[PDB]
Swiss-Prot record:
Quaternary structure note: F-type ATPases have 2 components, F(1) - the catalytic core - and F(0) - the membrane proton channel. F(1) has five subunits: alpha(3), beta(3), gamma(1), delta(1), epsilon(1). F(0) has three main subunits: a(1), b(2) and c(10-14). The alpha and beta chains form an alternating ring which encloses part of the gamma chain. F(1) is attached to F(0) by a central stalk formed by the gamma and epsilon chains, while a peripheral stalk is formed by the delta and b chains.
Function as written in the Swiss-Prot or TrEMBL entry: F(1)F(0) ATP synthase produces ATP from ADP in the presence of a proton or sodium gradient. F-type ATPases consist of two structural domains, F(1) containing the extramembraneous catalytic core and F(0) containing the membrane proton channel, linked together by a central stalk and a peripheral stalk. During catalysis, ATP synthesis in the catalytic domain of F(1) is coupled via a rotary mechanism of the central stalk subunits to proton translocation.
Annotated Gene Ontology cellular component terms: plasma membrane; proton-transporting ATP synthase complex
Compartment(s): Cell inner membrane
Domain of life, per lineage: Bacteria
Site (Mutation prevents the formation of a functional proton pore, but has a small effect on the binding of F(1) to F(0)): G9
Family: Belongs to the ATPase B chain family.
GO-annotated molecular function: proton-transporting ATP synthase activity, rotational mechanism; proton-transporting ATPase activity, rotational mechanism
Protein name: ATP synthase subunit b
The keyword Nucleotide-binding belongs to this UniProt entry's keyword annotation: no
Keywords on record: ATP synthesis, Cell inner membrane, Cell membrane, CF(0), Hydrogen ion transport, Ion transport, Membrane, Transmembrane, Transmembrane helix, Transport
TM regions (residue ranges): 11-31
Region of the whole protein represented: 1 to 34 of 156
Length: 34
């Protein structure tokens, strides 16, 4: 079942999360710790 778009979109779900951590968490994390 080579449903490309779903595997691609699973990788989107992963990458979007990961970079959202690299951007919407990094600065306030940095401010909190130093």
């Amino acid at each position: 079942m080579n449903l490309n778009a779903t595997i691609l979109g699973q990788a989107i779900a992963f990458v979007l999360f990961v970079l959202f951590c690299m951007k919407y968490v990094w600065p306030p994390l940095m401010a909190a710790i130093e």
